[PDB]
Design an enzyme around this catalytic site. Structure first.
Site, short mmCIF file in Angstrom:
data_model
loop_
_atom_site.label_atom_id
_atom_site.label_comp_id
_atom_site.label_asym_id
_atom_site.label_seq_id
_atom_site.Cartn_x
_atom_site.Cartn_y
_atom_site.Cartn_z
N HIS A 1 23.31 -28.76 12.27
CA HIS A 1 23.01 -27.52 12.17
C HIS A 1 23.00 -27.53 10.28
O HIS A 1 24.19 -27.60 9.76
CB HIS A 1 22.77 -25.93 12.96
CG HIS A 1 23.95 -25.60 12.81
ND1 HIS A 1 25.04 -25.34 12.12
CD2 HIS A 1 24.54 -25.64 14.13
CE1 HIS A 1 26.12 -24.25 12.81
NE2 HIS A 1 25.56 -25.36 14.42
N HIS B 1 30.70 -18.94 11.93
CA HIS B 1 32.05 -18.85 11.74
C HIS B 1 32.47 -17.85 11.29
O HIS B 1 33.34 -17.13 11.75
CB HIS B 1 32.96 -20.18 12.27
CG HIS B 1 32.94 -21.06 13.14
ND1 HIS B 1 32.85 -21.92 13.08
CD2 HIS B 1 34.36 -20.84 13.60
CE1 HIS B 1 33.36 -23.10 14.28
NE2 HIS B 1 34.73 -22.10 14.42
#
Ligand SMILES: [Ca+2]
Ligand SMILES: [Ca+2]
Ligand SMILES: [Ca+2]
Lengths: 595, 595, 99, 595, 50
Positions: free
Chosen positions: D477, D484
């Site tokens: 992606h 994160h």
């Protein structure tokens, strides 16, 4: 910004509270009512049409066997019930053929013709169409299907009613006395010979049946109901025989004052404000039963107005015999028993439910109770639920089940058994009901022959009719459910919510076997308010059975329905108070709901 | 297409009926309540603060002159009333200083200290905040401003209450007897010397005042109310002294049966179902009045709980003296009188309002009545309006007017007149009230000296206090309006709507002057049901005045308020029925409304 | 015309999804909770008051047999549970007598 | 009347609370997202079509220079992203040409062909279309345009990433150690030679750029984030290296008990209920980097699934090198770091935010916390915000920006520089990027040559590719923003609101330079909870940069987006509590919001 | 002794029968009575990185 709420005008908040309660009621949902299927089941052999023998047809013209003459009269009656139109009810056929010069009914019995009786009409046959401003709508609740004519249940219900009619002049305090042993022992062994009582329900039976099925009959449960508390202690609730504390007895600081009339408590005197209620009931002539002759019974089925024909003895006495409890429930106002119970509880100082606001000493909370959470509140609330409950039971009585009253069932039994002895078949549908009650019916034919001799009433055959305690028999409305039992249920639900229901009663009284007075019972006690209020509901409901006008299942199912109506009203009314509180209510099933 | 309406499910029609009723109530509008302005008018000379002498302050600590000690205690009490918060009510100051070891109150009188009395709290001081599912919201209706302490009206109200207290042991049947002539004639001439009675209202006066202003006092209107019917015939309503027809008396076709207990009718026995209500009331000791000593009166103003301290004679009797009517209204359940009236009417066969459905013979309409339009309907409806009316009068009592009870007014008079004789000024605001009642106060000081001697109660000065019939004096809530009178008003409005109110009563009874029995009156009759129901409302309301706990204006205004509450409930309930009918209701003002 | 549906802004569609889920939850109905009836059943022989021996009373002052000393302490506890008011919780009686 | 509010059913109140929250969310408004304009800028010289070199095209077939072969593949991919239709996603072109006989992809490298690698697919390419029941809708928030390939900012971001890759096996505790001085000083000097860092923003620059622009590079800020607290003290947050207090260490009244396992706290053991969590991480083979060979890199851009190919040393150790932080973020569950910090904070007894209800001693407020305002509440809240933040970054990543991952940018640089060495022009758009990074690229070609020799991988030319710490390079992606860092932003926001974020930590630890153990740091302290939680968020986000999978801008912008998502959840949830309280929240920008 | 017809359904669902070593101190969710007392998930580790 900080999350908040806004105020609104008082008028708008009042409107919104009423709508919110209406929404609460709408969100409960409505359940369908299922009938037992009998209505159109039984057919006339000759025409093929429905005969309506298992249905309420009191008032419609009947034939000599007690079946209606024209099925259209019942079918028009049903349409009238469901529309509520006054003209439609006025065009119905009521009563027998009238004489062209008198215009008066032509009755079968010499007795009805000699009195010139007129007809009586149905009582509020469309009250179940009426809405109400509070509580569950009348059509939103349901009673389960009634027992069918060929079931073990009905067999046992009829056996129990015939035995109550033969034991009507037996005293409650003498059930275990040697003078009544032959009757009591024979009553219990005959009931214990019926499958309803001597065999348990089977997996697969309808839950409603499992809940009302009774086991082994003993002297301790004979003729009693099954609400929790009814099987403990004396048969009669303390609240239908004792008086209350009287004006003048008080504790004023450290001084105890004794009323100069204190003995009235123990003589059945309830303090009602500054005046009194006496618990002594009028005494109907012992041993005189009614409708034991076929022609008079058919006249009453055809609407002959026999109301007011009973005879009484002078004076009054504390309830003593089964007949006196029947007399009590012949004329009571419908919330009478529960209002009197409430007055005893207030006068005796039984505490209110401790979860209600402001019940502590005034020095701790600075607030006494009256209007809300006090005596005025419970005194209006116990009586106001009565008409809401009646609207619901009228929907069940007339719009859904139309169950025949017990006297009509006795009519079917008498006709079938008399035809059988003449080697003929009439109403084969009750053959098993007649066969299983055979020894009971022998006793009843013998009791009815004496009654008919004493009255000078003659009709062909033996009479196996159910002796009625009331001259007119049942009221002019179907048997399932019951107005007395629905009201009992709602009213004792209010009282157990409002009062500290588990408070104990340490003084237990019964009626003396020799004199008209109260004596300390042999049952030690204590009893609780909830169990004696439940007992009182059962006493008034079962009293209607003792008069011959209801079956067990009518009473028990109606008690549960009235309980729901009362709980529904309390829930909707909870939106009106700003205080932080709830009613703690012990239900008939043994669980508690907090409202 | 042809214009039409659609059906909807039953549940939705029930919801829509409830909302529609709510909308009806909302559309009536809400009226503001105006108080008389006294609350903050009277000031303390030394501090400049409001003294609150014309306000209800029972329970708050008072000084030796009967004024509260701290104005903040009253101001905190008002805030508590308007919020309804339970903790806020619990933090209020109630009662006098307590003793550090006992924790018990320190009272002024030897009597209160010798009994160890504790305090009593306010009764439902925020019941006027509660909403209701039916009828006008409690705050949507109003009572006009109460009479002020310096008005001619209050002067006449106090004169009338002191004379009722001195004539408490006079028999109603002997008002025109030579043995009472000196008192009766002096009562009437003293009341006719006051401007309220001997001068008519003036153009410009408030309409509410014009409507309750009374004219010339005569023996025929002495101590009576002014509802239509109250001034005709005997003082006491037939419904509070006679019995009813008894079980066993009936007409069955062409045969007339006579009850073996028929004489009970004429002996004050009401048939209640199959049991009985006796009209005979408990007898409070004749000549013993209470709170005639200043220190005991101040202890009661400071919350001493004297409830239950009265003494009675053995037995019971038909109401005979003014005191017995006070005793009757000391403990009645609030709808008691009207429920008993209803039971007499049902047992005597008085017809229902002929505009209700199904009232014709059953042969013409095939429909009897019970649940709707019959006895069960009226029996629940008369009792259910009571708590709706009480919510409205509690809003007036506590949230709006907070009028001082009559005993506090007598306290102000006693203190001012005693200070005056010592050439001192205390409560100059009542100087005119004291001057105009001078001959009455001389009689009362002499009666109170005998009471205080008999009780062994000593306090400095003469006592001009109003003798109370009840040991605790008034209940713990303000004087205007009245719970008894608001309920009377609502309940007799229901009964006059439901019954054929103009039906005539041909047998008129009174209580015998020599024996405890009923005798045929000298008034020929007939009377009507409406006038005797109105009389009964007036008897219960004026009974509270005879006990010393209300003024005339409290009663009359509360009767009108309860009437409105009842009419409001009937109008909202009219949306629930499908039948074509209406209630014909004769109002207290002489006009009829059809609902 | 051919039956269709319309699009709406993302924001609206997001709002309507949250309302639709709230409606689903409202349509499930609400069921009542019944208790076993013990709370007020057990009584103190001497006073006649509820003794609360079958109920949670941990925290309230107990006597030497383990029964609460004052029934009002339990009743005030139940009121405070039902209101959630912090000041009302703070005024409850917790623990034994202090020095 | 007195203004008021009305109650409603519980069900209705729950329904209106959810609607009210939804309304709150709708009223915030939705902001548009603007991309940087590169997607369609770059064109293919021969066809004139867009070449898509600055966009994420991982998975689509690439040519030998790393550019996609067919522009329709990317345009079909964008349509699939915007519809979310599963069949449409399935019809996309993924991976290289396949072998007709085996069905297997044909790869360029011997390595991928020798392992029979298959393709891997895009991860949740339409998770940005999903709604949520709480918090800001995913498309209602925005990230600012990303840096363009020809900007000073991107030049700086790439220089930093190449230096991180060359410094991967350097230890955090030895940044200022003489052994690393040649590398550290040259890194600082080479970063300070770039305009982004040695020249300030200018008036007129976009505000988002001004806020993330960094200044002069020093040893103290080298490779660090810029959240408040990240530049104070040691590089690594205490919460990723220390253990916690253990079970058995407690104060019981006046007695202090010491756990028999107390030393575990200083050995990286977190008490997790009654079991433990170890802070030691798996050790990836030191010095082994991936995708340093052109053919293997192209296979990876063509979807070769290399996941799971890394090698490791036995055992585990406290985070020691830059590579270990990269290993930590390779497989962490997304809220792992914040849950672990939460557990340390609960076990060590750090106080909850003092504005929460009931945090005082139990003797003052009678109420402990757990479900609401206690440990269970924060434990569920810190983890539930994660999927709401991920939905919003998914919209950013796929539906809006589609930014190429850093590895792709390194591929552009490698191809261009090799073409230049051969007198050819390929990707002239990155000329300036290549020229400004010239010294750094020489070191990288040299390290890449050693890596390729060690692996036996051969491709024409020198390699200037960005060495990857993970065999598969980045996730499937786009780069902007980061999953994160969006989760880090939301999760620490929740923790700083729930705990007393400014409480001080007085014991500061670091990982020893010689041993695998914690030692007292030379930084005195104290540190705050807020600063170390912000530092922890920076550690996890920058560890993704250290792996070579993200740029600086990706992380900082995603941290700001996660913060907003968490704030919106708290605000919507504040309508659900009846208590009086608020969360005090110190935001990333220095200000505090009270929710 | 087994539950009886007429008992509350909630009681019939949780009533337990004869105790054996195999069900001693165990719950009645499906799967609780098969195999070892303790779930695998509260004693075993997992596959490791690598
Ligand atoms: Ca109290
Ligand atoms: Ca009629
Ligand atoms: Ca605490």
């Amino acid at each position: 910004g900080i999350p908040a709420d806004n105020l609104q005008s008082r008028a708008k908040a009042s409107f919104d509270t009423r709508v919110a309660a209406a929404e609460l009621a709408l969100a409960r949902g409505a359940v369908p009512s299922f009938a037992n299927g009998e209505e159109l089941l039984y057919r006339n052999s000759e025409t093929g049409d429905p005969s309506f023998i298992g249905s309420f047809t009191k008032g419609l013209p009947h034939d000599d066997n007690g079946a209606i003459i024209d099925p259209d009269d019942f079918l028009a009656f049903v349409r009238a019930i469901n529309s509520g139109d006054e003209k439609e009810i006025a065009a119905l056929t009521l009563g027998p053929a009238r004489d062209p010069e008198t215009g008066l009914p032509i009755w079968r019995s010499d007795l009805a013709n000699s009195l010139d009786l007129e007809v009586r009409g149905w009582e509020n046959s469309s009250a179940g169409l009426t809405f109400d401003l509070e509580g569950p709508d009348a059509q939103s609740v349901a009673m389960p299907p009634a027992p069918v004519l060929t079931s073990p249940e009905l067999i046992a219900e009829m056996a129990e009613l015939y035995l109550m009619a033969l034991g009507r002049d037996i005293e409650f305090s003498e059930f275990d006395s040697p003078k009544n042993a032959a009757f009591i022992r024979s009553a219990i062994e005959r009931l214990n010979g019926l499958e309803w009582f001597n065999t348990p329900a089977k997996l697969g039976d309808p839950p409603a049946e499992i809940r009302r099925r009774r086991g082994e009959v003993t002297v301790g449960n004979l003729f009693r109901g099954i609400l929790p508390g009814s099987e403990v202690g004396p048969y009669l609730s303390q609240f239908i025989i004792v008086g209350s504390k009287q004006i003048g007895s008080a504790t004023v600081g450290n001084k105890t004052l004794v009323s100069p009339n204190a003995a009235d408590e123990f003589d059945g005197e309830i303090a009602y404000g500054s005046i009194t209620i006496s618990q002594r009931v009028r005494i109907a002539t012992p041993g005189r039963d009614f409708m034991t002759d076929l022609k008079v019974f058919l006249d009453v089925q055809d609407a002959a107005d026999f109301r007011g024909f009973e005879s009484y003895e002078p004076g009054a006495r504390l309830i003593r015999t089964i007949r006196d409890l029947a007399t009590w429930v012949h004329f009571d106002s419908l919330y009478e028993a529960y209002l009197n119970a409430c007055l005893i509880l207030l006068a005796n100082g039984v505490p209110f439910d401790p979860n209600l606001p402001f019940q502590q000493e005034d020095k701790l909370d600075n607030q006494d109770v009256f209007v809300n959470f006090g005596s005025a509140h419970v005194l209006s609330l116990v009586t106001e639920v009565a008409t809401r409950a009646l609207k619901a039971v009228r929907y069940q009585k007339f719009n859904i089940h139309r169950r025949l009253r017990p006297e009509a069932t006795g009519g079917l039994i008498s006709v079938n058994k008399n035809a059988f002895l003449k080697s003929e078949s009439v109403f084969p549908e009750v053959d098993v009901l007649v066969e299983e009650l055979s020894s009971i019916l022998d006793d009843s034919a013998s009791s009815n022959e004496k009654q008919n001799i004493a009255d000078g009433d003659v009709s062909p055959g033996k009479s196996f009719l159910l002796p009625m305690a009331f001259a007119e028999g049942s009221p002019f409305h179907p048997s399932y459910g019951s107005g007395h039992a629905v009201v009992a249920g709602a009213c004792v639900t209010i009282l157990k919510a409002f009062f500290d229901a588990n408070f104990q009663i340490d003084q237990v009284f019964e009626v003396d076997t020799d004199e008209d007075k109260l004596v300390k019972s042999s049952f030690p006690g204590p009893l609780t308010v909830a169990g004696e209020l439940n007992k009182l509901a059962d006493n008034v409901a079962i009293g209607r059975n003792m008069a011959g006008v209801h079956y067990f299942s009518d009473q028990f199912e109606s008690l549960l329905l009235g309980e729901q109506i009362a709980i529904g009203i309390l829930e909707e009314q909870s939106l009106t108070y700003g205080e932080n509180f709830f009613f703690n209510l012990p239900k008939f099933d043994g669980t508690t709901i907090q409202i």
